[PDB]
JSON list of C-alpha atoms in Angstrom, two decimals:
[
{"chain": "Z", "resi": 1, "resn": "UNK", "atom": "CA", "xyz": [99.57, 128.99, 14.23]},
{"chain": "Z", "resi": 2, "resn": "UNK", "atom": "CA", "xyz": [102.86, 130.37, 14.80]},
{"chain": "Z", "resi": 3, "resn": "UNK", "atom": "CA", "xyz": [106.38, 129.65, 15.73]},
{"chain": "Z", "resi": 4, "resn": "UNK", "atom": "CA", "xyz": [108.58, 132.14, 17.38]},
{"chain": "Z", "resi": 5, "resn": "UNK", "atom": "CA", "xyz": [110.67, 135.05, 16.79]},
{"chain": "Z", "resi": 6, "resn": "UNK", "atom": "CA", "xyz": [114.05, 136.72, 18.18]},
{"chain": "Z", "resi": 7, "resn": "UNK", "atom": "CA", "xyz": [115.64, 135.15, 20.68]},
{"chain": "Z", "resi": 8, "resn": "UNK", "atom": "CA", "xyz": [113.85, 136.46, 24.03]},
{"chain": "Z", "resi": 9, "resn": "UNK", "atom": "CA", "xyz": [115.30, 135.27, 27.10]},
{"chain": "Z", "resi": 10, "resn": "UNK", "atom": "CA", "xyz": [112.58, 134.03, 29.09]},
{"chain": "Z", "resi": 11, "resn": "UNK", "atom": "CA", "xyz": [111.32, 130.37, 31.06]},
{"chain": "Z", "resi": 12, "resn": "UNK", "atom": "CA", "xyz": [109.69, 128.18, 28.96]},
{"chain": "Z", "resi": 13, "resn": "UNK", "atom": "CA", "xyz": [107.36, 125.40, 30.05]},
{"chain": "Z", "resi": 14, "resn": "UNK", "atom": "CA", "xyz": [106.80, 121.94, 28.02]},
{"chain": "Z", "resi": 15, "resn": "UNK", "atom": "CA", "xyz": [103.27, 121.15, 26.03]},
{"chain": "Z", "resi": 16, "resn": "UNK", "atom": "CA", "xyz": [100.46, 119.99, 28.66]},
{"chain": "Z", "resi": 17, "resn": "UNK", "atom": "CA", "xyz": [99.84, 116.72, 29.02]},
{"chain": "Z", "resi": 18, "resn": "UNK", "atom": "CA", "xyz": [96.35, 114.80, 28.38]},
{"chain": "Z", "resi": 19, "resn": "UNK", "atom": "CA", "xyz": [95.40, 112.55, 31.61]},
{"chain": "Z", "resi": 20, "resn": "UNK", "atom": "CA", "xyz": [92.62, 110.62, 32.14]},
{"chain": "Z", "resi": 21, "resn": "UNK", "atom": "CA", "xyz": [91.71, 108.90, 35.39]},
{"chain": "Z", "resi": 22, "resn": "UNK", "atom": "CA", "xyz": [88.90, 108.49, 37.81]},
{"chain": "Z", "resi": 23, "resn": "UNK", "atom": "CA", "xyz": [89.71, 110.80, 41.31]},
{"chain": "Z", "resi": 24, "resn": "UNK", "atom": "CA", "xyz": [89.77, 109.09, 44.61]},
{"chain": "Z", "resi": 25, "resn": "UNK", "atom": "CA", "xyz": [87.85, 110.92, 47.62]},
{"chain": "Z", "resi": 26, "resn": "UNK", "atom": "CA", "xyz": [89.90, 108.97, 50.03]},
{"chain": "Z", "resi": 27, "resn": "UNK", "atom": "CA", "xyz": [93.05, 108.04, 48.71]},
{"chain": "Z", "resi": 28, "resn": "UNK", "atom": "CA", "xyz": [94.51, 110.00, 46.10]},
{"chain": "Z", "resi": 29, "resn": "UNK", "atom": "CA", "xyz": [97.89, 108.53, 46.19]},
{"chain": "Z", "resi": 30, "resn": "UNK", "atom": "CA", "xyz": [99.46, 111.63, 46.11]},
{"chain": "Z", "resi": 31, "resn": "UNK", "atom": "CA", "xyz": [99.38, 115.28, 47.41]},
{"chain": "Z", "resi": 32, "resn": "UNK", "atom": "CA", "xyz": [100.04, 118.54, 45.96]},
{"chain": "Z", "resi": 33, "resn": "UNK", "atom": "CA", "xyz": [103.24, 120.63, 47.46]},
{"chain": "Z", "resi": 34, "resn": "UNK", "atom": "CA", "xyz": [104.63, 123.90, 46.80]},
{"chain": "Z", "resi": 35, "resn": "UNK", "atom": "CA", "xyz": [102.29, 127.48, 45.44]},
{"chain": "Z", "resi": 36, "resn": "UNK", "atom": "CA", "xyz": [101.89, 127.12, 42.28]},
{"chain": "Z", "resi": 37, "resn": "UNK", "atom": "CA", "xyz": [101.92, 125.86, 39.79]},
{"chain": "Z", "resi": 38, "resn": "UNK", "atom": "CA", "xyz": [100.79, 123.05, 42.39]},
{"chain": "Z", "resi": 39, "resn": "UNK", "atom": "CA", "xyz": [103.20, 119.75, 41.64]},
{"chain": "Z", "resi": 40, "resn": "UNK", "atom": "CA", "xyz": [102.61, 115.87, 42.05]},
{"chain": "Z", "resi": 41, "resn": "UNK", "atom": "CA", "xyz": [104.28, 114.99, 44.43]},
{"chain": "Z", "resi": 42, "resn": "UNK", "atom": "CA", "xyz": [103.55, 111.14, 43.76]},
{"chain": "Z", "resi": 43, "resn": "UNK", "atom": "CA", "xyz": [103.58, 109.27, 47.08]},
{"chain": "Z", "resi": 44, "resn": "UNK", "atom": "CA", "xyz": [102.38, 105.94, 46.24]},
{"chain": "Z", "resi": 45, "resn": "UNK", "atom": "CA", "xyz": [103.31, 104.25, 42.85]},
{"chain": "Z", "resi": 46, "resn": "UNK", "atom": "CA", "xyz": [99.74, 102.17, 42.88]},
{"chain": "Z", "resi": 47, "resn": "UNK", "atom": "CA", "xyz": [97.90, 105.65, 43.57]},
{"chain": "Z", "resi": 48, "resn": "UNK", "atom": "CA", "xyz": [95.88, 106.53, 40.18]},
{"chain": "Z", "resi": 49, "resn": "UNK", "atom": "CA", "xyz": [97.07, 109.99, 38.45]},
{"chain": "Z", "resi": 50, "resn": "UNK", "atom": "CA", "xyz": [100.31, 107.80, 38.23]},
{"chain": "Z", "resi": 51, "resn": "UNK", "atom": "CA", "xyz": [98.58, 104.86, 36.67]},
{"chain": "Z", "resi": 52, "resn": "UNK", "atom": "CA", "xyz": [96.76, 106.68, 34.44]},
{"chain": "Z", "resi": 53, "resn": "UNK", "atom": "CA", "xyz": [99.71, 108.30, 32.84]},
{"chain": "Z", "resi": 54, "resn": "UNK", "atom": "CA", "xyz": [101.24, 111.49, 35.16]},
{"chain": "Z", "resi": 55, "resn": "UNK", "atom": "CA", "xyz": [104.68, 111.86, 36.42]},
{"chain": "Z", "resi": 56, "resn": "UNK", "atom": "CA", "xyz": [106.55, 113.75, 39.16]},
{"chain": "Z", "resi": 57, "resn": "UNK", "atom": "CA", "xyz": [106.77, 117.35, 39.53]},
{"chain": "Z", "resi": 58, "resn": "UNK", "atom": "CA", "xyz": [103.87, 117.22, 37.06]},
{"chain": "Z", "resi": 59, "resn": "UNK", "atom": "CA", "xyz": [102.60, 121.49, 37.29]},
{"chain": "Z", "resi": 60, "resn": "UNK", "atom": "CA", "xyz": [98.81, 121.18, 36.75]},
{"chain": "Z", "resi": 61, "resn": "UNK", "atom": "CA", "xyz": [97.69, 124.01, 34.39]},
{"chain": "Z", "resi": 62, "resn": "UNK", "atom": "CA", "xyz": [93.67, 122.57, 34.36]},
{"chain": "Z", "resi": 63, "resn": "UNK", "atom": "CA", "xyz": [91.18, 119.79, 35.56]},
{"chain": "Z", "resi": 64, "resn": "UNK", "atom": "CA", "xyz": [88.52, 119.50, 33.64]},
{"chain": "Z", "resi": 65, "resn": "UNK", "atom": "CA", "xyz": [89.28, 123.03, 31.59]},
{"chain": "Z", "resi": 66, "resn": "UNK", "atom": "CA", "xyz": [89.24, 124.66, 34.59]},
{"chain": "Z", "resi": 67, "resn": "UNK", "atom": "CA", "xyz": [92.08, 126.66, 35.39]},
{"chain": "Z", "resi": 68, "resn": "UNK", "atom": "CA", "xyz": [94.55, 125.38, 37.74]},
{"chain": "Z", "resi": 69, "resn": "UNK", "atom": "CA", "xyz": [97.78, 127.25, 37.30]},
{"chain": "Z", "resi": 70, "resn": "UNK", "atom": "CA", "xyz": [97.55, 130.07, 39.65]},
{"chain": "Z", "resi": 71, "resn": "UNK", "atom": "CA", "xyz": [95.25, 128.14, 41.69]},
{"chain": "Z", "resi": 72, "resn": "UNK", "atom": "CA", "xyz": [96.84, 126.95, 45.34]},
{"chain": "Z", "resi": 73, "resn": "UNK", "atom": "CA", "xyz": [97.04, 123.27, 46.77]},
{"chain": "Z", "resi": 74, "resn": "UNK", "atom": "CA", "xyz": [93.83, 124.15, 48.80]},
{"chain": "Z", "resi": 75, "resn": "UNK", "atom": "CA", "xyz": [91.76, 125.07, 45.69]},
{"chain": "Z", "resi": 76, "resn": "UNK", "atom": "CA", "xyz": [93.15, 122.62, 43.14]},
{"chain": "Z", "resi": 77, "resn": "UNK", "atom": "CA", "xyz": [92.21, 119.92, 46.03]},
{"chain": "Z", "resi": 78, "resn": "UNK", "atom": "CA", "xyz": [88.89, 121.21, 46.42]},
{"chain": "Z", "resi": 79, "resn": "UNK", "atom": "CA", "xyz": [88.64, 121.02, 42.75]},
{"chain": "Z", "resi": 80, "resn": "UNK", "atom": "CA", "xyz": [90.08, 117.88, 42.57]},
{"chain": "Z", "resi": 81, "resn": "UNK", "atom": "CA", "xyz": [87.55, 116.49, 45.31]},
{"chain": "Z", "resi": 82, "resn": "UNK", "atom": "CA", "xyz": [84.87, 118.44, 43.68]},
{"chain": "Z", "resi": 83, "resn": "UNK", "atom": "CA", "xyz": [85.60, 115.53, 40.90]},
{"chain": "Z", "resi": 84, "resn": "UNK", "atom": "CA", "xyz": [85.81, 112.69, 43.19]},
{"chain": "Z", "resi": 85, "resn": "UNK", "atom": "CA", "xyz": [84.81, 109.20, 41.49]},
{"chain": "Z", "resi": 86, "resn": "UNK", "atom": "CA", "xyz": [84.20, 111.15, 38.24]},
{"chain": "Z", "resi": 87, "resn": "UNK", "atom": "CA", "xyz": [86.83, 110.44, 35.37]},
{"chain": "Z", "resi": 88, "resn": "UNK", "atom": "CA", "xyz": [88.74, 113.91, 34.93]},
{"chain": "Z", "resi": 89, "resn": "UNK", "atom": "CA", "xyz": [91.42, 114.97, 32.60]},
{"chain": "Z", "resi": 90, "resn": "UNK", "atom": "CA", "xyz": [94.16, 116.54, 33.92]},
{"chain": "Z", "resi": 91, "resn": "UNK", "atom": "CA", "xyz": [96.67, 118.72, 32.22]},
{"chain": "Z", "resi": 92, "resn": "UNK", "atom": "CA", "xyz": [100.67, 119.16, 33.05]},
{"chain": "Z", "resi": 93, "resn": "UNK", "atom": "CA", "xyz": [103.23, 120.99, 32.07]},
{"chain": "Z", "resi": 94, "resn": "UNK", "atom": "CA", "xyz": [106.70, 119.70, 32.55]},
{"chain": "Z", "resi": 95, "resn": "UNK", "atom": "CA", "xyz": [109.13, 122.74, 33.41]},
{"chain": "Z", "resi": 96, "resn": "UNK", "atom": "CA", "xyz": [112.86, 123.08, 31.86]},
{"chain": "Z", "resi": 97, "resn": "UNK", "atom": "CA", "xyz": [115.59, 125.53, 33.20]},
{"chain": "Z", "resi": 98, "resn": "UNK", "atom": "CA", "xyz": [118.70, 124.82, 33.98]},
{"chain": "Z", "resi": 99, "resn": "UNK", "atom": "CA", "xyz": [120.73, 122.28, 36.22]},
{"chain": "Z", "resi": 100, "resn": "UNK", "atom": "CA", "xyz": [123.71, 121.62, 38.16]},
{"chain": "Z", "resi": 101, "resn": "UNK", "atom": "CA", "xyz": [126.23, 124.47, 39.12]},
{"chain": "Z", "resi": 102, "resn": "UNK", "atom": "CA", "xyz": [129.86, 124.97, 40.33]},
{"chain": "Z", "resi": 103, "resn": "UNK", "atom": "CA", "xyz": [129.93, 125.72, 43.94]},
{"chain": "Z", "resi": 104, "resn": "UNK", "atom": "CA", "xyz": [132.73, 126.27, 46.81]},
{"chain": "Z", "resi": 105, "resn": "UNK", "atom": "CA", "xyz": [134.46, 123.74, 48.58]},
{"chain": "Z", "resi": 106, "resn": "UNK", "atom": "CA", "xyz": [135.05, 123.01, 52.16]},
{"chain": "Z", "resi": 107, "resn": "UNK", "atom": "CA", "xyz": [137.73, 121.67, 54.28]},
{"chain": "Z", "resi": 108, "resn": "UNK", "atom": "CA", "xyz": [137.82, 119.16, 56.66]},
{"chain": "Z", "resi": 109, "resn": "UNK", "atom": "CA", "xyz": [138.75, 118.96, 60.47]},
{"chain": "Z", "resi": 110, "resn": "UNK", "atom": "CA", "xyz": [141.82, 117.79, 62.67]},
{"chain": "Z", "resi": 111, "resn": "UNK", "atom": "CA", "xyz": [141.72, 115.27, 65.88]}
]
């Protein structure tokens, strides 16, 4: 085991998550948006991933042990399908960085 050492500036991602649910090869109840790592991008609260125990932004890292964090949206979905009616677990990371930011204002407009 280990902890750490020195303070090096770089991203750090949160401990993967342990899901367990049973795929849907017609209704997933949610899709899978950006590069990667692919999110959740939950659409419907009564999907499954969300019952079982997932969240929103949720970065898959693996299905099954496979590896899904370079992986795409296509090939996590084909590996998703691949699993279709079979009870999978899949694994998220949740990501921390900063948030909120002071910006420039604007003026309004005469009539």
């Amino acid at each position: 085991g280990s902890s750490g050492s020195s303070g090096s500036a770089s991203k750090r991602w949160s401990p993967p998550r342990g899901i367990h649910f049973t795929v849907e090869e017609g209704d997933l109840g949610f899709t899978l948006r950006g590069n990667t790592p692919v999110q959740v991008h939950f659409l419907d609260p009564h999907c499954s991933a969300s019952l079982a125990g997932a969240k929103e932004g949720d970065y898959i890292v693996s299905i099954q042990g496979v590896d899904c964090k370079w992986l795409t949206v296509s090939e996590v979905m084909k590996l998703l399908k691949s699993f279709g009616g079979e009870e999978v677990e899949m694994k998220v990371v949740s990501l921390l960085d900063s948030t909120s930011s002071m910006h420039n204002k604007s003026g309004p407009s005469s009539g």
